[PDB]
Design a protein around this ligand. Sequence first.
Ligand SMILES: [Zn+2]
Ligand SMILES: [Zn+2]
Ligand SMILES: [Zn+2]
Ligand SMILES: [Zn+2]
Lengths: 351, 351, 351, 351
Amino acid sequence: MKGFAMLGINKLGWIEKERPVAGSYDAIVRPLAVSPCTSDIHTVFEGALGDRKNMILGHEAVGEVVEVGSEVKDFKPGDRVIVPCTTPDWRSLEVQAGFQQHSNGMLAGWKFSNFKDGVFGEYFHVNDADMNLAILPKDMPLENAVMITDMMTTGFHGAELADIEMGSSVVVIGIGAVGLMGIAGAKLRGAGRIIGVGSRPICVEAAKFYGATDILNYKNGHIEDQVMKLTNGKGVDRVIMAGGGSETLSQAVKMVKPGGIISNINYHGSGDALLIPRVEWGCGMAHKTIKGGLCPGGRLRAERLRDMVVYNRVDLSKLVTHVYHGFDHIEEALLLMKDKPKDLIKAVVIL
Amino acid sequence: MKGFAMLGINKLGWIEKERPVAGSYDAIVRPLAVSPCTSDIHTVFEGALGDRKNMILGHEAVGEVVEVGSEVKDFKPGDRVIVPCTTPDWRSLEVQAGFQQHSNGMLAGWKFSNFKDGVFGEYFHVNDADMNLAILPKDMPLENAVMITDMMTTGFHGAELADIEMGSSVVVIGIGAVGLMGIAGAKLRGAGRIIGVGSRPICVEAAKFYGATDILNYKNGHIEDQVMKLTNGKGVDRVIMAGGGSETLSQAVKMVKPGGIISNINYHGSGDALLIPRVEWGCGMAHKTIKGGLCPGGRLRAERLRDMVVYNRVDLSKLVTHVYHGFDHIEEALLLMKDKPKDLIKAVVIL
Amino acid sequence: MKGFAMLGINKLGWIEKERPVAGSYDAIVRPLAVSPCTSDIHTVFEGALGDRKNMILGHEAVGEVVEVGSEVKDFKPGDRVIVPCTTPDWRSLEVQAGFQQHSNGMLAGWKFSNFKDGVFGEYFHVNDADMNLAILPKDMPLENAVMITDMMTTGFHGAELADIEMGSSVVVIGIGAVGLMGIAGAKLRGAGRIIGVGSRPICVEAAKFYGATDILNYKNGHIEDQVMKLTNGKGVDRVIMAGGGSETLSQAVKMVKPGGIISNINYHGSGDALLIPRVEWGCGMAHKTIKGGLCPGGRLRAERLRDMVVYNRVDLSKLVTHVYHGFDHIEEALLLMKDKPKDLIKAVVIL
Amino acid sequence: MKGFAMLGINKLGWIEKERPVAGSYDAIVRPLAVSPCTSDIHTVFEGALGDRKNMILGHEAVGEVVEVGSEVKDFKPGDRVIVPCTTPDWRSLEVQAGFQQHSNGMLAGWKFSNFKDGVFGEYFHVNDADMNLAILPKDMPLENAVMITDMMTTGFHGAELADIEMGSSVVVIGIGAVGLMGIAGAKLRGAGRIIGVGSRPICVEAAKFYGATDILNYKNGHIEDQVMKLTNGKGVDRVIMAGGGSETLSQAVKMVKPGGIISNINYHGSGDALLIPRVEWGCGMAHKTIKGGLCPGGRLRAERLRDMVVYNRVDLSKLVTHVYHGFDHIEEALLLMKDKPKDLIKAVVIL
Ligand SMILES: [Zn+2]
Ligand SMILES: [Zn+2]
Ligand SMILES: [Zn+2]
Ligand SMILES: [Zn+2]
């Protein structure tokens, strides 16, 4: 089969690969719709996850089941399914410890395009079908459903890790697709004021659409200062880091209140470390908690998020600015996440 | 001064009481708008809190500060304020333990109409003005603001105690004002499916408006059985008990999943005890957690909820079905909470 | 293969059954040491598990693996293992939802002598060996190791569910083996005062050994009243229900502080329900949380507790008062759990 | 009155100030025994707090109440009390928010020798006596009681923040008094393996006494590498930062498992910032939570820890290696926390 893979760090292209075979508990799926992620640009042109060779990219897709193992009971050929980007090995001590995202290793719950051939191929492999797939509702637009697989689960996890309280004030740094879902998630956790930080006009409008009450541009003065001004020097209760460089950690620390929580869902693919300003972190005694985690995956998570969409808790259509028809457009679509044009949030390639 | 008080069990009427005086940290406030509560009914016509004599009723009001103690720094005469029904004594070991609602005693955080003269008087006393009051926004309708003091904080507390997860399935038993805010709060905590239980026409519509995806009526078969069918034998993740008799606990236990949480915010006014069905509670080993708590109060809570209304996170106007002008209407309004006409949800008396 | 089973109601006796075969991920184990449980006595002499046709009893044992399925990778014949009484199916949505104990059904994580032959047989079946077994340390006395499989995990789970704080006052109702581990677990969560409730001398001394600072005899006065006397009418922070009748719930609600937590680890098998005293439960608004759950099982749980024993965090030898050397002494021991002498806590048969 | 104070940054000496006067809710206390803390050495010869003008030092004391305001109800002249180093303003929004330690400002809950005159004076002021004092048991040794005020509450808070689970593996970096309490606290939260890092012989022996199962000398090599060796490359579940410089944060991240928690109670008064290693922090998605907070204070905390000592949950006598007798020794004592000989842990000057 054919697949669009990374031909080593800093290089990519279409390659020929043997079609994967399903294990007793797995399923082979052919994509019906896929989307490129900024994370795949970190992995390729930054090698933030180490080197790789001939690894088919992509981890955001909805498709049709073509083959299932002899032990698969809840899925069969013909089923259209939503595939979370995180497909953990449920039989691991990490799962028993409460962290499905790290089953058998740090980040190992996320396989597709991490270390396992991705969804940008005529067919792809899903480990443990019954535990990692969810049925795609018949009336659900493909482009919308693809947003559940990574953007929605990641942005919401940002809101979940933030442990938001009814009326909490929240700052979401970065209003790209992940940041927009962080805003939506924060609103769906009861947040009062929500301050989104970004400049790309299209993202600014979506930010407000999802719940932002204030929008700040990281080019009108240090974001910390702006936030303090807006909050009368009181700061905010929570900060979700969803975009920008590692310096955003310091900014988050300076703008969050003592006792607050900073939740990172931004995949930092460059630099040796992230700095915590000593003074503003109360010399390590300000109870300014810092969290950061990979998005949850698996069937339960996908079914729960899917159902929220079906119940109109969030409108994912606003995330998709670019829709293409035809496998060949995957190359160009991915390159958009690298060049990032002004009118782009997320792109979906419908096969 | 005059006030509408409980002349004793089953007796209501206007009486004279000395005008309250503020201590160093207190404030004397005159009501601008008030609302009667079903709780006032449990206390009077059922002595749910024990015998009382000439206690002014009511605990839901927005008003104007007339006098403040010498140590009050953040409030002054003339200030328009939102008064949370729960006004805790912040200097207590219970607060130090994390439960403001029980400062100096079980339910002692709630004073108005519990054991302290209520807001149905020409003037009422608010302990610790700086810690228990919030400014009423200049553009906020008085009837809407009154809904923050009890209905919103209570219903939302139901959702908070329910520890809702993104996409959780939730059943709210009872769709009166409190149940409606429970539905709104559940959606604002990320709930997917929300099943409201009620039949009153106006309440049914408000419930769907606040987030209910399904509506069930008792007069159509045992509620627990109906829910089991709807969830195809699986049950729901969470249950918020907002209204009805004590037998609703058994209903909640039967419809909730193992590991689920039952959140009670219903003020049970009669009966010796509440029953838990042994079998369905997994003989006490099914991790079906049961919570039950008094709504939070105090300045922080009121300001956070106030701000949620300002940022249109919830529309409180749908709760007020009846509006009266004139202090004297308090009697008629309070009686409606007793009669419960099918077109009533909440009534507000604007002085 | 022979094994002491429940012939029928009030009927016990050895029987002949075919040796269970292992599935690809299972392991067959032969007992090295086992222990009768109060739950064994109730399933038979009380039909607390309906009617079972020739079901081999027992669910507390440590042993030697004799066979493993083709897909088992961490265990092999000859391995000595600790077998947690709860061996759930790790591939289920309940597990993805955070409740291993109820995987594929309420209390379904508990299989041995529930709907699967128990450990009182020459050989027994363990589902998913890699996820549900833990190696038995070389120099760990067998009697102590068996106490891990249920007494330790259950008692400690009572302390875990109680969400004990440093210096918290705790009451453990019932000082049988489970209550003793509840006492030890509470001390291991930092409890200050620990009040044990029971009457048998052997248990009273053991309770003090594990951490009890006060002892109350339930036969000499209403327990809630005695607790109020010990606490100057203030009540306690937490209550762990580990014994006695279901009225113990009412007693627990009456002695616990508002905002407190009641943790049930006792199997309630009589009557149609448990009662919550309305008044003392603050009419359902006292924030007196009620929890109850089957002990966690699985490999991680077993290795973690095992290591606590290895690092001498708890001395389990005090739980074993009767040690038999012989495979046939199983019937004697089980009946020894029925007639329950005053000098018995737990009996261990080292075959 | 006299006393030892911080006559500016880097300059010490006894100054003459007007004996403090108690307000309506305050109390004046005469020290019976006090102890110097490394924390003051910082504020002084490091200016980690900024600049201070004539601030009496010391915040670890047990004393006699000699004067109370007209509103104090639970304490009176003659009472012997335990004074927590942290004495919050319970009437603040931060308290309403759940953070007593930062009432009215970051770290503002901590007054003595922060911005308020300390206890190294003939008499000191205690804000809100009823809310911030605890009775000293008559049998409890003075030197032991002093250890409660800061060392115990801080070390235990380190264990609390770490959210330790039964059987968790824990590493405590630094074994000075605070770290020793962190070890004792970790053990009292159910920890299995506890690895202590330090070299002072007296501290190492105290580490083992309080629960340490392994001891590591950071001078031997990168502690993260030593820890990985000890745990066969698996890392540990939790880390408590109680000593060393800001680089210990990186070491903590490198030795803790994904999903683990890092708890800082170490007061970092030097350097621009602490670094988080990008790769080992899973690029910010490894769920390696980082917390850090000032110790809790107030009456409830003091009474709970006091009771733990009374019930022998922890033996504080091991922390006191130096005992003097004379208010004039205070000066000498504090100097020990500066040079710090290898046979000293904490010093107590009895008056
Ligand atoms: Zn992605
Ligand atoms: Zn009310
Ligand atoms: Zn058992
Ligand atoms: Zn200190």
